[PDB]
Amino acid sequence: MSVIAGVFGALPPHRYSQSEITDSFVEFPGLKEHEEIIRRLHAAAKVNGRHLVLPLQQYPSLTDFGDANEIFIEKAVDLGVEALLGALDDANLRPSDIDMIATATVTGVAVPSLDARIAGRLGLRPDVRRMPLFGLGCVAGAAGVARLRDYLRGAPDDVAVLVSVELCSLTYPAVKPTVSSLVGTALFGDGAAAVVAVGDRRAEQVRAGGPDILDSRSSLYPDSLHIMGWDVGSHGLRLRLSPDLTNLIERYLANDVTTFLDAHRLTKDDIGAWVSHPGGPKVIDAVATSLALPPEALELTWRSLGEIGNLSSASILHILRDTIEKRPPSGSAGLMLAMGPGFCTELVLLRWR
Amino acid sequence: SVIAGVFGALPPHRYSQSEITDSFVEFPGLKEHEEIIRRLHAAAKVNGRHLVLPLQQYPSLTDFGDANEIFIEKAVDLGVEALLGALDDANLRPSDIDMIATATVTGVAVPSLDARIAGRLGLRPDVRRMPLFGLGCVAGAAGVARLRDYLRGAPDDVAVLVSVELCSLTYPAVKPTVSSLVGTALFGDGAAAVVAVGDRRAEQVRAGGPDILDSRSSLYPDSLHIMGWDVGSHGLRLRLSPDLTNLIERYLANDVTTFLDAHRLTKDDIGAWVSHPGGPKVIDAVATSLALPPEALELTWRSLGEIGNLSSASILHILRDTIEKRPPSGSAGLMLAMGPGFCTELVLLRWR
């Protein structure tokens, strides 16, 4: 039941327009033959830009999972300590201060994990507690905040941090011109995010500013492991994405947000700030649709989607910051809502103050 | 937070060390390394291991895509088997579970195993998932420590950890090298589960395992190189350092001494040491740096013998071994582990 003190988003210095990404992408070896679907898909995404970790003309030559994953380890680390520092400074705090650190990626594999590495680089205390969260995916933005709270609930003098870093570009080695992967090449970008939360008691001493994390609720939809995730093989991390995903949302997401809110004597009309994860236009439309929501509401999410792409688990944090920035109106409540492999969902109840 | 159930689970197939080595030297290429493998395999002091697959099938397992595929299959079955076993020990149902945490380092699944487990068991659709990868063999002690950390913010809840390690299946990445040959002598397959319950819920449920009083993690400066996965095209390649033992000899005594002094205890107040069996040379270093007579470590020694090093799962087999030995009441106990990081986790237990 504890309170965010800092949010920060980092991203590769190379921003490319979507048309530039496409104009070039179609000219990639073995792709020109699928120009038509590529153009349409990259234009269907409502993504105007994307930071990439490498120069755009280097991906065509990135084809070994072994190479790309070493690039990941080198590259994820540095965006992370950049994102952590940004948040620690937002929170008027220092590395020594951190008692636990959760790490979220689904986009490369690292052992020892990112947190160990980011712990080495920032000089965090040797006895920092490490929670490297893998295989949660796009929902680890909301889920990562949850495990944070769950931790500070029973440790109110404490400082916990969540670093999300997803470098989708580097999964290229396993991208072939089939619909799922191509949907992938239309939406996903590279980015990092960090959140610094603190105890209620600790909150008053370092004057936290973010809202509080009041409650959470996971929701794991059954018989639906296939809806998304990775097929993992010698060629890297192969994006598995199903069309059935929007269907599941519309038929159950209303139910979830109703039971989570009710348990707080609340209706969907009290939440004065939504922070929703942008899986892509049809997903953002389905959720707007299911929850009977006017467009004012998900506006920061479409605008984040247009500006940085889909960043997996880092997006919601980027949007989280976007809305924090726009200071709602003191007392109001808010609702993170993320979804990812499972298939599953995550709602975080938030109060601003 | 207090332990309620511990249970270990094995694949049906067992094979003695000599039976494994005799076949292993056959495998292609491998016959021209027959000396060292025989040397290495004997000095692992491992007498038998449970391989998830039939022995003469590995030589054909050359693809990491195939291996990871089979991993996901055998890994859930085996983890359910474990969770079910610990859940029964506790006399609790899968539907009583509030949090599930998962330790694997040997296969990459997204969605995590814990999701695939949570479905196979019909755990509540709102159960909290905490997949962890890759903590390494530290992950049994470290996971028990996240449990405490969870339940301590929720005293009425039921949390579980399930660790599943299928090391034989990394095999598409082993080559004729000392460090991949080492791991070939050491690591076996298996799984284990721990159910812990929160304070306010412990009486109401008859919680019999040890209370958990605290843990201490210890990340060593500039030490990535010591333990980890070389990830790539052929799968997960073991990378293990000989410098290892000389990190232990260096900083272990200070790790535990520091932990214990926080509780104003001495090493002499611990009677039962719960130790990770990373093979003979590592276990000596541990007996040596903390001066524990051959008595204090005997359950791990035997475990490394019967079962092999099962990565993050062994320490939970030993924690179960020691508990069924059922320690003096109120006496006190120490879990100690080490994985990739390079790091150390210490868990102070109190028997009941």
From the candidate CATH numbers 3.40.47.10, 2.115.10.20, 3.20.20.220, 3.40.50.11740, the one assigned to the domain spanning B208-352 = 3.40.47.10
**DSSP notation for A193-229:** EEEEEE-HHHHHHTT--S-EEEEEEEEE-TT-GGGEE
H or E stretch at B151: helix B139-151
Q: How many CB atoms lie within 10 A of CB A74?
A: 11
Contacts of A186 (CB under 8 A, 6+ apart): A38, A41, A42, A44, A45, A47
Q: Which chain A residues in 112-131 lie under 8 Å from chain B, judged by CB atoms?
A: 112-113, 116-117, 119-120, 124, 126-131
What does the alpha-carbon distance between residue B163 and residue B268 come to, in Å, rounded to a whole number?
Answer: 30
- B104 CA: distance to closest CA in chain A (Å): 10
Q: How was this structure determined?
A: X-ray
- A108 CA: distance to closest CA in chain B (Å): 9
What does the alpha-carbon distance between residue A239 and residue B171 come to, in Å, rounded to a whole number?
Answer: 25
Q: Are B318 and B274 in contact (CB under 8 A)?
A: yes
Query: How many CA atoms does the CB half-sphere of A339 hold within 13 Å?
Result: 27
Per the listing, tokens 């595929």 go with B69
Which chain B residue has the Cα nearest residue A148? Answer: B150
Resolution for this PDB entry, in angstroms: 2.0
Q: Which residues of B are catalytically annotated?
A: 137
Contacts of A61 (CB under 8 A, 6+ apart): none
**DSSP notation for B12-34:** S--EEHHHHHHHHTTSTTGGGGH
**Residue A210 to residues A1, A77, B54, Cα–Cα distance (Å):** 13, 25, 55
Yes or no: domain B1-207 corresponds to CATH 3.40.47.10: yes
Least Cα distance to A6 among A85, A79, A76 occurs for A85
Q: How many CB atoms lie within 10 A of CB A88?
A: 23
What does the alpha-carbon distance between residue A163 and residue A181 come to, in Å, rounded to a whole number?
Answer: 26
In CATH, the number for domain A209-353 is: 3.40.47.10
**Cα dihedral A14/A302/A174/B68 (nearest 10):** 120
The verdict on a CB contact (< 8 Å) between A69 and B231 is yes
Token duo for residue B157: 């809840």
Active-site residue identified among A10, A88, A138, A324 = A138
- A234 CA: distance to closest CA in chain B (Å): 4
Burial of B262 (0-12, 13-18, 19+ CB in 10 A): exposed
Burial of B69 (0-12, 13-18, 19+ CB in 10 A): middle
What does the alpha-carbon distance between residue B309 and residue B295 come to, in Å, rounded to a whole number?
Answer: 20
**DSSP notation for A228-285:** EEEEEETTEEEEEE-TTHHHHHHHHHHHHHHHHHHTTT--TTTEEEEEE--S-HHHHH
What does the alpha-carbon distance between residue B262 and residue B254 come to, in Å, rounded to a whole number?
Answer: 12
Q: Which residues pair with residue A105 across a beta bridge? A: A134
Q: Are B181 and B37 in contact (CB under 8 A)?
A: yes
Token duo for residue B50: 């449970």
Sign of CA dihedral B311, B312, B313, B318: positive
Q: At what angle do helices A140-153 and A315-325 cross, to 10 degrees?
A: 70
Least Cα distance to B185 among B84, B304, B79 occurs for B304
Q: Are B64 and A234 in contact (CB under 8 A)?
A: yes
What does the alpha-carbon distance between residue B83 and residue B101 come to, in Å, rounded to a whole number?
Answer: 11
Contacts of B161 (CB under 8 A, 6+ apart): B100, B101, B102, B103, B140, B143, B144, B146, B147, B193, B194, B196
Q: Are A253 and A287 in contact (CB under 8 A)?
A: yes
- In chain B, breaks (C-N over 2.5 A) are found after none
The verdict on a CB contact (< 8 Å) between B133 and A136 is no
Instruction: Report the binding-site residues of A for substrate.
Output: 180, 241, 277-282, 312
The alpha carbon of residue A335 and the mean position of all alpha carbons in its chain are separated, in whole angstroms, by 15
Cα angle for residues A340, B134, A5 (degrees, 5° grid):
60
**Residue A181 to residues A47, A136, B12, B142, Cα–Cα distance (Å):** 16, 19, 39, 36
H-only helix segments in chain A: 18-25, 35-44, 65-90, 114-122, 140-153, 179-187, 200-205, 245-262, 281-290, 299-308, 315-325
Q: Structural domain boundaries of chain A? A: 1-208, 209-353
Per the listing, tokens 């150390």 go with B344
What does the alpha-carbon distance between residue A261 and residue A207 come to, in Å, rounded to a whole number?
Answer: 28
Q: How many CB atoms lie within 10 A of CB A34?
A: 18
**DSSP notation for B219-284:** EPTT-GGGEEEEEETTEEEEEE-TTTHHHHHHHHHHHHHHHHHHTT--GGGEEEEEE----HHHHH
- A36 CA: distance to closest CA in chain B (Å): 31
Q: How many CB atoms lie within 10 A of CB A160?
A: 27
Least Cα distance to A240 among A222, A223, A224, A220 occurs for A224
A252 touches chain B (CB under 8 A): no
Q: At what angle do helices B280-290 and B298-306 cross, to 10 degrees?
A: 180
Task: Give the one of A109, A116, A219 whose C-beta lies nearest to B219's C-beta.
Answer: A116
Cα angle for residues A336, A135, A317 (degrees, 5° grid):
30
Contacts of B329 (CB under 8 A, 6+ apart): B351, B352
Instruction: Report the binding-site residues of A.
Output: 180, 241, 277-282, 312
What does the alpha-carbon distance between residue A84 and residue B20 come to, in Å, rounded to a whole number?
Answer: 48
In terms of DSSP bridges, do strands B158-166 and B235-240 run parallel, antiparallel, or are they unpaired?
unpaired
Fold category of A1-208 in CATH: Peroxisomal Thiolase; Chain A, domain 1 (3.40.47)
Q: Which three-class secondary structure string do you get for B68-123?
A: HHHHHHHHHHHHHHHHHHHHHHCCCCHHHCCEEEEECCCCCCCCCHHHHHHHHCCC
What does the alpha-carbon distance between residue A189 and residue A177 come to, in Å, rounded to a whole number?
Answer: 18
Contacts of B300 (CB under 8 A, 6+ apart): B274, B275, B276, B277, B283, B314, B318
Q: Are A112 and B227 in contact (CB under 8 A)?
A: yes
Chain A environment of B234 (Cβ under 8 Å)? 234
Q: Which chain B residues in 25-64 lie under 8 Å from chain A, judged by CB atoms?
A: 63-64
The verdict on a CB contact (< 8 Å) between B231 and A111 is yes
Q: Are B25 and B37 in contact (CB under 8 A)?
A: yes
Task: Give the one of B146, B217, B340 whose C-beta lies nearest to A111's C-beta.
Answer: B340
Taken as a whole, chain A contains a residue count of: 353
